[PDB]
Design a protein around this ligand. Structure first.
Ligand code: PT5
Ligand code: 3PE
Ligand code: CLR
Ligand code: CLR
Ligand code: CLR
Ligand code: CLR
Ligand code: CLR
Ligand code: 6UB
Ligand code: NAG
Ligand code: CA
Length: 1261
């Protein structure tokens, strides 16, 4: 039977695997044991599949006697399938729920394709460096869960219950936590009473009652999805003073810092893989392919036209054709024609005038005829096949073929695909050829087409992952999202396309918590067995985001690096060609230092001044001080300019200072129409913070760097804008005037949807309510191109995109209402737009920033030998010294010191800290009195033990050596906050019990990997304090502008501008901007800031709803773009600062080995000094790590022979000093040289390396 196992038997089994995957898609999970005929057949087909994968595992089992992971998966799948079938037939715990193993069968499609197995291994092998970040995330989640347990435990269980009973939550359809008259949170007021006893904001799922519930809430907040909801619930529960310190800090630490770490590690790994695969020379094949194609058409056209110069009438037939295409006039004429085609395509809109629809149909045919004629003219003058040779010419040929195909229909339906004339806009991308960077865009496309095979493999593995998780979700939650609620969920797992859409939505991370809550309630509620189903959503989110990162960052980084290398090589070749061609043919106190400062302080004070204004109250005593305080502030800057204007006559920042001061001074007057002009020059007062530039060195540097980066990435921005415009045109064709709906679902026209109709509260037939029928459009529609660009932008931001998707799926016909699930196949448009724009273009932009930062800097060309290990080795050897030990004396201190400095004591206290953390982690809601007393006494016992440790280590280490390790002063401050915590506990303040949790960081700061990673990234963050000052300034400026513009809108609890979210205070405006930067409901806030809102009663006819502004669109879009750009800039700057650690190659010698050697050497020296023992070398050569020193070889051997053979410094037997022997060890480890090269190293170290300050007098020999 070992004969038929290598023939296409293995392809027969592969086809069997594909038909057990197209039978798990056809399956429809019906609610409550329902079925149909297709399922009745699929059972028998699965029986046949089970028979086949059994006698095929038997042959391999009785052929080779289960070791490989894939064959083990085969075996387990087969056995559980047989077990499930047998148990199902016998019973004809849940029986049918054991069929979830059948979704592992598609995982075998990569075991039969090694080409997919290699990319799977490449994706998997990048997980190992991220395990440290995973551990850090776990620790942060645990710490914040315990803090939330200690802060908000069981404080969100009271809602308004009305003053007639406790029937059910008579506070809107979305009840919120409240507080009593003795509380600080939200007050119900009017005919309501804040009565204790209530499930929770999300049916009791979102709260800090338990440690598991707190951990789930913390994870959901860290994923940045629905964290403002939790923050606002906490604000309503306990108050609006100190939950922002919790939630904002959690968001900053666990979402931005962690993302920075992940991006840095992934970029370092990708760079290492690139530098390892470049040695093979894969770039050469791409390099040699471009020049072979450049000379191809350059020689074929030479052959072509030489035939026409002749020796039938081609002399008067061919010269003009090739002299018109290359005339530079045909180029511009074709560009103008394409511009006209774009003009007529983009002029289409809903309810257009009847003349426009005729103009744009006549012009379409005319331009189609013209472009076909031009294509035919070019088709023969440059060879029929040589015309096909070119890249963009293939695009033109395909566009013409498709246009001719779709313009002759004129009888069939759905003419939306006829608008492939929009891809003709890609042909005008030759406008880059006239300008620069055309060799940077076309090189990118060439690299993409060269690597399309790996691109397809990477995109297919992601599709397989999505298919597997969609099948698993269809099995788990299929036909279960059917509860008694009146509204029907749209994101369900009922079908295969619906499951695919739901899994894609969860992968994008938008409203994934809603699907998680739906899945949790489908299995009961917040209970131990029911709520374990959230593991599916957690794993799906984490793994999908990780896979998307590893795919779309690898593609972008590799392709962009290849394109940049191609461009650099091409530039070098052009330089060499044009050089060799030329090498032959030719042959007043304002200039002070303290003043300046004092006035950059005033500038800071002036910036602080206008942030403290009152946005809403026009007249208030606080503004009396501030309004008259700016008067004296403006005088100082007015005096500053006059004192300077005499010195000279002008730069570009004195212009800005003048534009500030003159505007302020004229604004002091104005009078007359003090409504419009004042409201412009009052918001023009946001330029004062910008005066810190040119007055604070470093701010100017970072601003100039950001401007250079903008100028570099403008090409990618332009290409993304072009693609967005094309997709907007396609969407306008698809959904023009189709996204209208009526409040009454029974009317499908505007004329019908008129008058009143009866609604029922919660669908209770006994409670009818009259409401008016209204013909409404979608929030973001596709009526015209401008209305579609913004809808696509909001889709790309992953904000409210499922709502638009499910609104577009129902649309069927212009001017008519929706139909449930009319065109589910239209979701491919949104999927493709998200993949191309929100996933590929964004990662291309980030990789472009990374590459343009990497090719800057390191290209300083430090070509004074000394490659990228030895400079660091030499500087470390120069900057080194023996360390201290402090070995107790008093012969009594030694005993306690030995006790406290052992490893067993350290491990014992680590276990004690773990036990204390576990004790803190089980403070549930509704605990009994015995539990509380036991917890109190256990906390007392732990704090006593830790005081005992502290006393032991003041003695052992003395009161000077204790407060020397910074881990000790932090420990000292922690426990003293626990001793006096018990003092105030028996007779409150919640701040003092948070010190116990903070002690868990000692466990985190014990592994050499996480410690080094965190330390290096923190140092890189500290070393760049202005890249974050840029974000701070942007936030401040936009907060002030929002306060001035939208600061008067009313706080309506049913609108997105309310008590928790508003512009009425600088902290509140900053919090709103932070929430928008996270991207929570920024589109909803923008729509709530549009003009026509009744607003603040405390500001003072014809003004019914006169406030608001149409500036909101630009405000909220520009803020999003600028915030994303600046955050990416900061991330890449930190990554490039820390890039040395991210690409380390730990196998080779590194500074960590030097640190270990120093820590081994430290104990043998009583002081720093530099005096050693001659016999100490015996243990020195044995204690060194073999990669750093020598292995398990005998001491008195060639190791000692070479140690003594080297010319040591002319010292005594043991008076040689530490840096000398360190340099000797580093030079013997690597970069070895023959005798007589000492002077070469001596002269080299004083040229490129830092100054020695004549401190190497004894190190010369
Ligand atoms: C309150 C929070 C405040 C905490 C401040 C506590 C400070 C404790 C004292 C620290 C002393 C400073 C030294 C220190 O410990 O810093 C780091 C680790 O610490 C963290 O990053 C610690 C990272 C902790 C971050 C997790 C925080 C998450 C929870 C926050 C909750 C906040 C709750 C707020 C909610 C409020 C509710 C209202 C270690 O410092 P290190 O210098 O010893 O580590 C080095 C480093 O790795 C070097 O590369 C290398 O030596 P050098 O080059 O000579 O330095 C050695 O490693 P290699 O040779 O392998 O390279 C190590 O020796
Ligand atoms: C990059 C730079 C920006 C990053 C974004 C960080 C987020 C900033 C969050 C700070 C504002 C959060 C909201 C807030 O502080 O709430 C307002 C609160 C008082 O709220 P109030 O409406 O007066 O409620 C009365 C009932 N107590 O106000 C207060 O009482 C606290 C205000 C403190 C302001 C913080 C400044 C630090 C000093
Ligand atoms: C899809 C991959 C990860 C393999 C499948 C693993 C999961 C989906 C499988 C393996 C173990 C299975 C569970 C084993 C036991 C029980 C308890 C029973 O009362 C209901 C079914 C239930 C709850 C099964 C549901 C499906 C299950 C959780
Ligand atoms: C040539 C390309 C790049 C740009 C094309 C711009 C022109 C054709 C487009 C862009 C925005 C369009 C407008 C968008 C919306 C409106 C409002 C309404 O009254 C219908 C027509 C009108 C006024 C459109 C007319 C055509 C329009 C002005
Ligand atoms: C996502 C995959 C790859 C890994 C996670 C496995 C998931 C799907 C498995 C592991 C544990 C499982 C749960 C274990 C126990 C129960 C309780 C039972 O009364 C209903 C099913 C339920 C709630 C299971 C649902 C499926 C489950 C959550
Ligand atoms: C580094 C720089 C940008 C920090 C700037 C901080 C300034 C703008 C912040 C910090 C503290 C803030 C104040 C904190 C509290 C209040 C009380 C509130 O009822 C009105 C606003 C007011 C009076 C704030 C005004 C703005 C303020 C002074
Ligand atoms: C790593 C571990 C030890 C951390 C802490 C987890 C344990 C101790 C936590 C998590 C889940 C918790 C339980 C979950 C639900 C309830 C129901 C409630 O009415 C009484 C407490 C009780 C029974 C909790 C007791 C403590 C508990 C068992
Ligand atoms: C500089 C960041 O701008 C964005 O956040 C973009 C989003 C939203 O960010 C994508 C988050 N996934 N949506 C659209 C479509 C974009 C646009 O209109 O380009 C002009 C920009 C963008 C701009 C330049 C380069 C890339 C991108 Cl993605
Ligand atoms: C704003 O709040 C008031 C207070 O009850 C309410 O009457 C009004 O309807 C709200 N505005 C809107 C648009 O609903
Ligand atoms: Ca969201």
């Amino acid at each position: 039977i070992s004969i038929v196992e290598w023939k296409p038997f293995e392809i027969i089994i592969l086809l069997t695997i594909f038909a057990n995957c197209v039978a798990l898609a056809i399956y429809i999970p019906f609610p409550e044991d329902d079925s149909n005929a297709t399922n009745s057949n699929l059972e028998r087909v699965e029986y046949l599949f089970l028979i086949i994968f059994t006698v095929e595992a038997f042959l391999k089992v009785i052929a080779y006697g289960l070791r490989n992971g894939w064959n083990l998966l085969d075996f387990i799948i087969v056995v559980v399938g047989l077990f499930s079938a047998i148990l199902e037939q016998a019973t004809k715990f849940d029986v049918k729920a054991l069929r979830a193993f059948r979704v592992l069968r598609p995982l075998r499609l990569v075991s039969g394709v090694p080409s997919l197995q290699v990319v799977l291994n490449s994706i998997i092998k990048a997980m190992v460096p991220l395990l440290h970040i995973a551990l850090l995330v776990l620790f942060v989640i645990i710490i914040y869960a315990i803090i939330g347990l200690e802060l908000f435990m069981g404080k969100m269980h009271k809602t308004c219950y009305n003053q007639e009973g406790i029937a059910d939550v008579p506070a809107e359809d979305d009840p919120s936590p409240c507080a009593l008259e003795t509380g600080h949170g939200r007050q119900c007021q009017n005919g309501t009473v804040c009565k204790p006893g209530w499930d929770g904001p999300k049916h009791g799922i979102t709260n800090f009652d338990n440690f598991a519930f707190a951990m789930l809430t913390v994870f959901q907040c860290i994923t940045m999805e629905g964290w403002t909801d939790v923050l606002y619930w906490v604000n309503d529960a306990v108050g609006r003073d100190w939950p922002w310190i919790y939630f904002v800090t959690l968001i900053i630490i666990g979402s931005f810092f962690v993302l920075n770490l992940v991006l840095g590690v992934l970029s370092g790994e990708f760079s290492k893989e690139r530098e390892k695969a470049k040695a093979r020379g894969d770039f050469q094949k791409l390099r040699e392919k471009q020049q072979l194609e450049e000379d191809l058409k350059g020689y074929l056209d030479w052959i072509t036209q030489a035939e026409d110069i002749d020796p039938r009438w081609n002399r008067f037939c061919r010269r003009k054709c090739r002299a018109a295409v290359k005339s530079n006039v045909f180029y511009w004429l074709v560009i103008f024609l394409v511009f006209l085609n774009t003009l007529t395509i983009a002029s289409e809109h809903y309810n257009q005038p009847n003349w426009l629809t005729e103009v744009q149909d006549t012009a379409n045919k005319a331009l189609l005829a013209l472009f076909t004629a031009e294509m035919l003219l070019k088709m023969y003058s440059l060879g029929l096949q040589a015309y096909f040779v070119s890249l963009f010419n293939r695009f033109d040929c395909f566009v013409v073929c498709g246009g001719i195909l779709e313009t002759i229909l004129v009888e069939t339906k759905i003419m939306s695909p006829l608008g492939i004339s929009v891809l003709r806009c890609v042909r005008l991308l030759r406008i880059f050829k006239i300008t620069r960077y055309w060799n940077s865009l076309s090189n990118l496309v060439a690299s993409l087409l060269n690597s399309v095979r790996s691109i397809a493999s990477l995109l297919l593995l992601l599709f397989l992952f999505i298919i597997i998780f969609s099948l698993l979700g269809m099995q788990l939650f299929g036909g279960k999202f059917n509860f008694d609620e009146m509204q029907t969920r749209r994101s369900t797992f009922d079908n295969f396309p619906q499951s695919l859409l739901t899994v894609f939505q969860i992968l994008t991370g938008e409203d994934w918590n809603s699907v998680m809550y739906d899945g949790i309630m489908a299995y009961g509620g917040p209970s131990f067995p029911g709520m374990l189903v959230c593991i599916y959503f957690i794993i799906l989110f984490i793994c999908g985001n990780y896979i998307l990162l590893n795919v779309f960052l690898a593609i972008a980084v590799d392709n962009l690096a290849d394109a940049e290398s191609l461009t650099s090589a091409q530039k070098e070749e052009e330089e060499e060609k044009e050089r060799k061609k030329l090498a032959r043919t030719a042959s007043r106190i304002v200039n002070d230092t303290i003043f300046t400062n004092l006035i950059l302080f005033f500038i800071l004070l002036s910036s602080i001044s206008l942030a403290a204004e009152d946005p809403v109250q026009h007249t208030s005593f606080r503004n009396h001080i501030l309004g008259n305080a700016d008067y004296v502030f403006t005088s100082i800057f007015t005096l500053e300019i006059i004192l300077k204007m005499t010195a000279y006559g002008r730069n570009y920042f004195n212009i800005l200072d003048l534009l500030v001061v003159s505007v302020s001074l004229i604004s002091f007057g104005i009078q007359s129409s003090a409504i419009n002009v004042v409201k412009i020059l009052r918001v023009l007062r946001v330029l004062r913070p910008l005066r810190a530039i040119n007055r604070a060195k470093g701010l100017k540097h970072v601003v100039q760097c950001v401007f250079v980066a903008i100028r570099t990435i403008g090409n990618i921005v332009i290409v993304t804008t072009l693609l967005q415009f094309m997709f907007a045109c396609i969407g306008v064709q698809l959904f023009k005037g189709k996204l209208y709906t009526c409040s009454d679902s029974s009317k499908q026209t505007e004329a019908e949807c008129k008058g009143n109709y009866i609604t029922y509260k919660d669908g209770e037939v006994d409670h009818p309510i009259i409401q008016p029928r209204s013909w409404e459009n979608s929030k973001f529609d596709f009526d015209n191109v401008l209305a579609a660009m913004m809808a696509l932008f909001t889709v790309s931001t992953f904000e409210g995109w499922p709502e638009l998707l499910y609104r577009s799926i129902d649309s069927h016909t212009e001017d008519k209402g929706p139909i449930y699930n009319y065109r589910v196949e239209i979701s491919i448009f949104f999927i493709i737009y998200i993949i191309i724009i929100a996933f590929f273009m964004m990662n291309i932009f980030v990789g472009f920033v990374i590459v343009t930062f990497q090719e800057q800097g390191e290209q300083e060309y430090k070509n004074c030998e000394l490659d990228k290990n030895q400079r660091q080795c030499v500087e470390y050897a120069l900057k080194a010294r023996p360390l201290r030990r402090y070995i107790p004396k008093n012969q009594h201190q030694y005993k306690v010191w030995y006790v406290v400095n052992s490893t067993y004591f350290e491990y014992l206290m680590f276990v004690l800290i773990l036990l204390n953390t576990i004790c803190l982690a089980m403070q549930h809601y509704g605990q009994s009195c015995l539990f509380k007393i036991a917890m109190n006494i256990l906390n007392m016992l732990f704090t006593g033990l830790f005081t005992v440790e502290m006393i032991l280590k003041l003695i052992a280490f003395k009161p000077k050596g204790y407060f020397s390790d910074p881990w000790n002063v932090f420990d000292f401050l922690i426990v003293i906050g626990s001793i006096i915590d018990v003092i105030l506990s028996e007779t409150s303040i919640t701040f003092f019990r948070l010190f116990r949790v903070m002690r868990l960081v000692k466990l985190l700061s014990r592994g050499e990997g996480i410690r080094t990673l965190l330390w290096t990234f923190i140092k890189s963050f500290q070393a760049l304090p202005y890249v974050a000052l840029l974000i701070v300034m942007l936030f401040f400026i936009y907060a002030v502008i929002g306060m001035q513009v939208f600061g008067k809108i009313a706080l309506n609890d049913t609108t997105e501008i309310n008590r928790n979210n508003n512009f009425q205070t600088f902290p509140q405006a900053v919090l709103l901007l932070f929430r928008c930067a996270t991207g929570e409901a920024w589109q909803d806030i923008m729509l709530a800031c549009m003009p026509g809102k009744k607003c603040a009663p405390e500001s003072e006819t014809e003004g019914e709803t006169p406030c608001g502004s149409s500036f909101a669109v630009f405000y909220f879009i520009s803020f999003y773009m600028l915030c994303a750009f600046l955050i990416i800039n900061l991330f890449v700057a930190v990554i490039m600062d820390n890039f040395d650690y991210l690409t380390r190659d730990w196998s080779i010698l590194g500074p960590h080995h030097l640190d270990e050697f120093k820590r081994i050497w430290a104990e043998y020296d009583p002081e720093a000094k530099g005096r050693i023992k001659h016999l100490d070398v015996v243990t020195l050569l044995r204690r060194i790590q073999p990669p750093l020193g020598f292995g398990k070889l005998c001491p008195h051997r060639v190791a000692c022979k070479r140690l003594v053979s080297m010319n040591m410094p002319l010292n005594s037997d043991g008076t040689v000093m530490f840096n000398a022997t360190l340099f000797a060890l580093v030079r013997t480890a690597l970069r070895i040289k023959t005798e007589g090269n000492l002077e070469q190293a001596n002269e080299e170290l004083r040229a490129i390396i830092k100054k020695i300050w004549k401190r190497t007098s004894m190190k010369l020999l």
